[PDB]
Each structure stands twice: as structure tokens, then as C-alpha cells.
Write a protein that binds this ligand. Structure first.
Ligand SMILES: [Zn+2]
Ligand SMILES: [Zn+2]
Lengths: 310, 143, 310, 143, 310
């Protein structure tokens, strides 16, 4: 019985390095050799209480690739919860009697955690809970990073943009800081600075990080340039100055990048990456996105199948 | 000083009334004696509570390390302090506090709050079981 | 060829006791021994012209469990009918040329009936037609009631809340009154009283029923306490006084319940059941909900498979 | 006993805490002493409050009339009781309470709450100076 | 200096029988012998935060018929309290440095009392404050009863409709209770019952009042039938049933009415009075309205002019 069998995947902070590595391993193994009837006779819930394209479509796609069926909803507008005013708990109290695992994304922080408390012996996979966590993004992020960089340790990672509300970078920083000798550069408006709780964690783990105010300051040091979108829809009123992007990456800005460096972005992008970067040999966000398929296939196989796929 | 019971000494000024309200202390038939704003060689100005024939839990006594850190809880039997406990910070606090994150899921739903407690430089950090954000205990309000 | 093969399931009033029993039997048989490729090569429409969570998700889930495929829509907003103004008939005139059976819920009473007149040799399963009928809820209700009570006859059933607009209790009262010696207690505001047509039916069948104004009056007599939500979205203006619940069941109110009695609720609940009932040994609504899977699997197998599942 | 201040004796059990909250009495640097659930100068159980260097106008004392009509207020100076007064029903209660009427002009605007007090059968009624509605003292909450 | 010189006119409950009579007496003098310029050089505020036809128009007409000028707004929409959220306080604080008197209607109860607290030596005339008081409606009412029954003592007066939210009947009952041996009939839906405080005051003064469920029980023995409108914009959600007029007077209902009895209504009316009543000799609502001009001239004269009129 593999370590991840029947485990909720709520938060990076609840996962060992061994765990991440295990997903990545299981992953590539299935990209190598598809196993298309693995989750046959499984019905999974794709429960998106807020918009998604990449996260959802990749998940449902992965479920199919492994031979499972999908029931769900793509917004809460046409559920009992939207029109009839139902609790999340009640909502998770019934669906969990229907399906074999619940993939869900919710506008409030803590929603996936809450679901586990009502979901019974049904696992929950957190597809995004407010500005909190994004375990599955991180899993693909990792995969993409190994793919292009060779290792997950001893890297110079820069994260730029909305670091306060970006669940993507919360989960990713926690993940990377479970590996050896990584070093961070944070490029954010002061209002959307990486939260104190990630920092305090870096410090306890004795991990080098520093703030900067331009991309160039760090360009030539960077292995991974991870750009992020401003979470417009998660902002507080006193932050509306920060709606527009503060750092726009252009192709001209890539003059001094180390050759190995890839630009990542969990997507979607507004303008924080101009379309003229797409063509450079540093752009790797679409490739990154496509990696969501193997990360998620992996995760699903691991959680719903007792024994490791060979 | 009394027959038998509990004396909570060295509560800080303005906290005493709070704890009364908080632990529904005043909701007994027992004799209670409360001094507010007593002089205190020890600290500076102090509050002080005595409940007769009544004792505190263990966590309730630690869930007291939040507001009254350097407080001293005396267990008293037959006019003699037969015990002298101190509040040490618990691992967590449940049911009693409320997450300052307005977008925390905890607000809407049939769930008790819950926070993780770790001592920081100047304060005490509280991390909510749900939204996973961390706050100063000063920031966190009670319910 | 089983009695229910290719039959529309529009209204309890169109079904024999033998029929209900047959669903329940077929049901448990499949909960006992899943038959996962039974409806292979079947495409079913999940056509929800109004919001659902339990009814829909359970249906699509059941379809998958039996190996069928699902096409559909979860609201009418993005069909031709919403944006282009199309009749239900026309809508049912095309889909019925696509799929092998139509599961549909509609805001107007009589919609499922109307669909049969345009659906051709394609069966329609009514998932809720306005404040009228809810055959499939009733099927699970029955199942749950047998599960927990041992029989379907000689029961003291109390129904509480919006009895006028609750399709749930219309179908359920008609169903139960096809069995021997059941007795009813109706607890409703006068404005949402159980309609005269159900009463007249009870009387012709010589079935004992009575009104009350509190739960306690009947508590100690009751085997099944069936709570219902006020159909806010089906009310008429002169009824807006009745939007809030009139009877709130709490755990304290369960002091004098017979030991066998279960609290049911088709769900979702607003406040007519406080969350502190969830923990008692009388709460059985989530269990009830989970029973939707076996009732619906059954119904589908019966209608689309000639010969009974062994 | 105290040197100089006011002493509220003969408060019916379980009211002491109420009066301490409702009138924000512990909101002071002044030395206060409180006994909950005591045997009485008269009755069986009794609450009691002493506050140093603080005095109550005859109006302040009347305010008590709605929560502790039997209470006695002693004015203390030089450890001696120099005054002794008793709560009679007041004309009004300003500031303390909030009008139950949600559509009252008193909520949004910068004015103090104010009701007229009258005895109405076995109960006290409050009429808001502003909206002119009437409520039973039981329903009208404090700030 | 007459007893009303420079006095706030906020609640009937703060006025004496002599006050009322003073106003009526004055009313006549001015109606018989106008005084086009009695208030020359005066500028008055017409501040209406909620909608108004009769009360605002009649009032401004009074100001012109006495030679005064008007400034104001019929809608709190275009003020700095409407588009910039100014406190009603600040609003009064500045307006009261501009004008010699303020006439205001406001949606919150108590708005007028509050204004007196911020206007200094500038008087405030209540033109309706939410569901509380409507003093100058009581004065034209009183003038109208006076002119049609030749007295204000010993009348049989019925009040129909929404008495709970009816600021019109709150003031008029308190004013009629200031005279002798008037008897009252309150006819209204339970939810819109005439408020306890009004009843307690009647009781205290030992005045006979009684409830009734229809207009025909009292019709034979009433002198003034005073219909009102359900105050829908002031209703609570739990009251939304009552929106529709529950008592509808129509000409045939007046068959056994007294030769002298008049039907009154503050207006506007929804359906509570059928238009066939309009032509009967009992209809007096329009005359009533026209009387507002006199009561309001009167009131304005006394408040703004030191010496009694002749
Ligand atoms: Zn939280
Ligand atoms: Zn008020």
C-alpha cells in the first residue's frame, strides 16, 4: 500500500520530500508507459466552485486517460449551494457518498481542508483553495523543473508578481524548501509581498532568500523565472492600485539569462509576460502546462490505486 | 486566601475582567473575589481572582498563557497553597478564537475554529487550521 | 421483457406497488453485486433546465456505474432555449434523436410529461417538474425507508414544511399510500398545506391522516420524520411570509422519539434541521442521499435493459 | 474596606457581573474590589463592588434601578461612609443602550442613545428619544 | 410670541390640545383672509430624502402663498449625502446656516428629532420620518374632520389598513386622544397591528378602542372612515404577504353609512379605495388633501411669525 493511497492532498505543508519525489517518479513512469484502464470503475468528482481552465481540464483529462468517469460542475451557479444556499459541508456530505475521490477548488481559504472533515473515507484533492494552496500546480511545477533543470536541489529560483495571494507560489516555495540548498529571489509590490509565514519557514530551515525590485537585479543569477498573475479577484479594496502588473517580462529582458534558465508561469497570464517571449528558447509555460497531465495522472493513480504502477 | 480553591495571581491590568467574561467564570454559585488594579511589587499594577471550591483544567490553565503569561495559579486547600502551577503555551487552541482572515472558510460553516501556537520573537504566532495564514495573537479576537 | 422496460417515469401516480417493489428489489441486488458494463454503449441525456446537486450528480454517477456515457447541460443559460428562445418540444424533438433516454428536470409543472409526447421511442425520466412530481426521489425515499424500518407498510410517517410546493412529498405520499395501513401526520403552514388532491386520494383509499401544528404532538408516534425545505423559488408573492422555515428540528426535540425512528430530508436543508441533529442516531438524510445511487442505478437498468438483472 | 470611593452593596447574585460589563466599570486605572456570591447584610446571596476614588451622581445611581433596585450605594471618604443613597427609577438612560429598531436614525448618525423609562405593569418600558418606538427593558441590549 | 413661535414640530406626542387648536384656528383666518406677504424675506428648506407628492407640493405651495422662497431637493440622490455619503447630521449642520426653517422627510425614524439637534435656532418641521410621525398630516386631517363633523370631541373614528407602519395613524390617534370621548376602531391584519405604545396611551387616558376584522361591523356607527396604504417600502421580509390591500372599500359598502360620515385617506392610495367611492358624497380624500394648504400655511405662519394672525 503506497504511502499516498487514500490520502487527502490539501496542502504542500502536509507532504514529505519523499512524497513529492514519489509523485514525480510515478508520473514520468506513466508518460513513459500509459496505463489506460488503471482507474476503471472509478467515478471522480470534478467540483469547481470557481473558474478554471488548465487545472480543471487537465484533471478531467487525466481521469479519462486512466479510464475513470467524471461527474461535476464548473461553477456553483447551478447547484443547490448557489441557488438554494447550502453549506459546503452538506454539499461535501452528499457528493462523498457518490464518488471515489473529490477534486475541488473553492473561493475561500481552507475549503479543501473542511471537505475532508465531511468527506468520510473519500479522498479530497485540493485544486485551489482561495489564496492558500495549490498542491497539484506545485507537483507539475516540480516536474517541469526537474524536466528542464535536471534536479530539484541547488537552484536559483525567482518568483515575481502577486506573492501574497498567489496560492501557486505558496505551495511551490514550501515544496522547494524541502530540498537542499535552493535560493529564492522575490520580486513583488510591497502590498503583495510573499507572506511572513513562508518567510519564517525559509528561515527556520536556514534557506537563503532576498527581496529585489527589478528582474534584472537577479536575471543573470536565475535558473527558474516563475512569473505570476495578480489575483485581481482576491484583492482587498485598499489594494486596487495593484491590479495592473508591476513587472512585465519582455524578450529584450532575456539578454543576460543563463542558458539553462526557463521562464515558468502557472497561467493564465495577463501582461506580465509579453507574447514576444513565447518564441524564445526560455519560454516553457505551455510545456509546463502540458506537464499538468502527467503530474495529475500520477497523483490520481497513487491515491486511488494501492500498489505502485511499475 | 480562603478555605479551598483557586487563586490566579499576577494577571496583568485590564485582563482580569476579560478572563471573567471569557471562561464564564462568574457563572457559578461559588464565592468569587476579584481585585482590579491592585498594587503589585512583583509586576507593576495587577489583577487577581479567587474562586472558592473551584479548580481549573490543565489546558484551560494554559489557554491562559495567551493573555496572562506570567500569571501564577495557586491551588489552595485548607488555607494553604498546596500547589503552584504556571501557564505554559499549548500546542493549539480550539473553539474559542476567530480567524482574522475574512475569507477563511471557518466563518461560514459548521466547524469549530482551531489555531496552532508557536512562540515568536515579540509575540505568539497563531496559524489557523483552515486558511493556513498566521497572525499575531494581538490581532486575533475571541468568541 | 420486464414491466418497466422503455417506460417513461413521469409520475408516481402512474406506477403500481409492484413497480416500486421491483425497483427496490432490482436496486439492492446491484448494491449487492455491481454490474458495471450493463448499459455499455448507451448515451443518456442529463438535461437539467434548473439547478440540482444530489439529483443530477447521483444520476450521472449511476449512469457511469453501469457503464453508460452522459451528455447534457446543468442549466438552460447556454442552450438555444435560453439564448435563442426555443420550445421544450423542439428541444426534446432533437435530443431524443441523439440519446437512448432523457433524464430531465424543469421549472414548470408538466414538463417531463410534455417531453414524452415529442421524445419518440426514447424514455424520459422525470428528475423534477416544477412543484409537481419527483419519482426518483420517492424511489430512494422508499429504499431508505425499507432499509431502516424493515417494511413499507403500517408506518407512522410525518411530513413537515412546505407541503404545497414540495414535489418530494407529493410523490412520496402517493407511493406510500399504495401500501397497506400507513398513517400520515402533516405539519405545514396553512399557506403551504398538503394540496387537496393528495388528501382526496388518501380518503378514497381510506387512509388515516391528520394535521398538526407542532412536531411534538406526533413525535412519539412517528417512525419516519420527513422534513422539507421551503420552495422559496416556487412561491407566489402572497406567500413571502413563508420564506423562513416554520418548524426547526433540533436534537433536544428528539427526547421522546421511538427508537426506530429516522429523520429523513430530501435535501438541501436550510435550517429546518439544525446541524446538531447530524450526530444523533436518528439522522439519516446523508445515508438517505447515498441511497439515490442504488435507486437510480436500478431504475436505469430496468428501463434500458430488457431482462431483469439476476 | 477602602479609603475613598463608592461601594455598591446588596446586588442580587448574577447581576454583579452584568453591571460590571454594561456600565464599563472596570474601565479605569482605579483600584476596584469585587465579591461574587456572598452572604448578606440582609439576604442570603449577594454581589458587591467597591471602586476607589470614584463617585456616582444621584443619576448614575438611579441608572441601577433597572438591574438592581435593592442595591445600596455607599459614598466613602476617609474609610467612613459619609453618604448613603438608593436607586430610584430614572427619567432616561443615555449612552448605555442601543435601540432595537434597525431603521432608527440613531445608528448611522453621531448621537448618543437615549430612552425614556417608565414602569409598565410587571415590567419597564423604554421609548427611544429618536424613533419613538417602545421596547421592554429586556430586549434592548447594551453597546 | 405665540406658543409655537420658533418651535420644532416633530411629534404629535409633544403637542397640546391647545397647540392643535391654535393651528386650526389660525388656519381658518388665513383661508378666509389671505396674507400674501406674511412671510416675505424668508427662505425655507424643502428637504425631501424620500419620495413625496402631496406633502412636498402642498408645503411649498404654502410657502409661496405667504411670500417665502423655497430651496431644496425632492430626492436625496443628488445631494452630497446621496452621492458622497454625508451624515444627515453634517447635512443639517450646513443647511441650517442657509435657511430660516427646515421641512424634511426622511426614511429613518427619528430623523427629524435628530436634525433639531444640529440646526441651532432654526426650527424643524417633520414631513414624515419613516414609520414614526407625520405631524402636519394630522393637522390637515384634524382640520378636515373639523370641517365635516363640526367638532373633534365625541367622534366614532375607524382606522383601516397598515396601522403598524402608518405614520399617518400614529400621529392622528395621539392627537384625537387629546380630545374627549372619541372612540376608535382599528381594522387591520395582525402583522400590521396598531403599535402597543399607542394602545397603552389610549388605555391610560381611559379611551374606548376595539379591534375589528371588517369594515361592515363598524360602518353603521362611524363618523370618519380613515383608510391607509400598506407601507410596502417599510415592510420586513416576514411581512411581504401583507403587500396587498386586505380591506377594499367600494361604493356599495357605504349603503348603511351615516349621512354625515366621510371617507378619508392621506393618499396616495393603491386599491384600498375603489374609484366608485370617488363620486359618492362620502368621499373626502381630495378635499382633505386640498386642506393641507391651509394647515400648512397656518403651521408655517405660527412657527415663523412672532405675532398671532388676524
Ligand atoms: Zn482561517
Ligand atoms: Zn430608536
Amino acid at each position: 500500500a503506497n504511502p499516498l493511497y487514500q490520502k487527502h492532498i490539501i496542502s504542500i505543508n502536509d507532504l514529505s520530500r519523499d512524497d513529492l519525489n514519489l509523485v514525480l517518479a510515478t508520473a514520468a513512469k506513466l508518460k513513459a508507459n500509459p496505463q489506460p484502464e488503471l482507474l476503471k470503475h472509478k467515478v471522480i468528482a470534478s467540483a469547481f466552485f470557481e473558474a478554471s481552465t488548465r487545472t480543471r481540464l487537465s484533471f478531467e483529462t487525466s481521469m479519462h486517460r486512466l479510464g475513470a468517469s467524471v461527474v461535476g460542475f464548473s461553477d456553483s451557479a447551478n447547484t443547490s449551494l448557489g441557488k438554494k444556499g447550502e453549506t459546503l459541508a452538506d454539499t461535501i456530505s452528499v457528493i462523498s457518498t457518490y464518488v471515489d475521490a473529490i477534486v475541488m477548488r473553492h473561493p475561500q481559504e481552507g475549503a479543501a481542508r473542511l471537505a475532508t472533515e465531511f468527506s468520510g473515507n473519500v479522498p479530497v484533492l485540493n485544486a485551489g483553495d482561495g489564496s492558500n494552496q495549490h498542491p497539484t500546480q506545485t507537483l507539475l511545477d516540480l516536474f517541469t523543473i526537474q524536466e528542464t533543470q535536471g534536479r530539484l536541489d541547488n537552484l536559483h529560483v525567482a518568483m515575481v508578481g502577486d506573492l501574497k495571494y498567489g496560492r501557486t507560489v505558496h505551495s511551490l516555495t514550501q515544496a522547494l524548501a524541502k530540498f537542499d540548498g535552493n535560493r529564492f529571489y522575490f520580486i513583488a509590490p510591497d502590498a503583495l509581498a510573499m507572506p511572513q509565514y513562508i518567510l519564517d519557514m525559509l528561515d527556520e530551515k536556514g534557506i537563503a532568500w532576498s527581496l529585489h525590485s527589478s528582474i534584472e537585479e537577479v536575471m543573470a543569477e536565475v535558473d527558474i523565472l516563475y512569473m505570476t498573475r495578480v489575483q485581481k479577484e482576491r484583492l482587498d479594496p485598499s489594494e486596487y492600485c495593484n491590479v495592473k502588473a508591476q513587472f512585465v517580462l519582455r524578450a529584450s529582458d532575456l539578454h543576460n539569462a543563463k542558458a539553462n534558465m526557463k521562464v515558468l508561469h502557472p497561467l493564465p497570464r495577463v501582461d506580465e509576460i509579453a507574447t514576444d517571449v513565447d518564441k524564445t528558447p526560455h519560454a516553457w509555460y505551455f510545456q509546463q502546462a502540458g506537464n499538468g497531465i502527467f503530474a495529475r495522472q500520477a497523483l490520481l493513480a497513487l491515491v486511488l490505486n494501492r500498489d505502485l504502477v511499475l | 486566601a480562603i478555605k479551598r480553591g483557586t487563586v490566579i495571581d499576577h494577571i496583568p491590568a485590564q485582563i482580569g475582567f476579560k478572563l471573567l467574561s471569557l471562561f464564564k467564570l462568574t457563572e457559578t454559585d461559588q464565592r468569587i473575589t476579584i481585585g482590579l488594579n491592585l498594587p503589585s511589587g512583583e509586576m507593576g499594577r495587577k489583577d487577581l481572582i479567587k474562586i472558592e471550591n473551584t479548580f481549573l483544567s490543565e489546558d484551560q490553565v494554559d489557554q491562559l498563557a495567551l493573555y496572562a503569561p506570567q500569571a501564577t495559579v495557586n491551588r489552595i486547600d485548607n488555607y494553604e497553597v498546596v500547589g503552584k502551577s504556571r501557564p505554559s503555551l499549548p500546542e493549539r487552541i480550539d473553539n474559542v478564537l476567530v480567524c482574522p482572515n475574512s475569507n477563511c472558510i471557518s466563518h461560514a460553516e459548521p466547524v469549530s475554529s482551531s489555531f496552532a501556537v508557536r512562540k515568536r520573537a515579540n509575540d505568539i504566532a497563531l496559524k489557523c487550521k483552515y486558511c493556513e495564514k498566521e497572525f499575531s495573537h494581538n490581532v486575533v479576537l475571541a468568541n
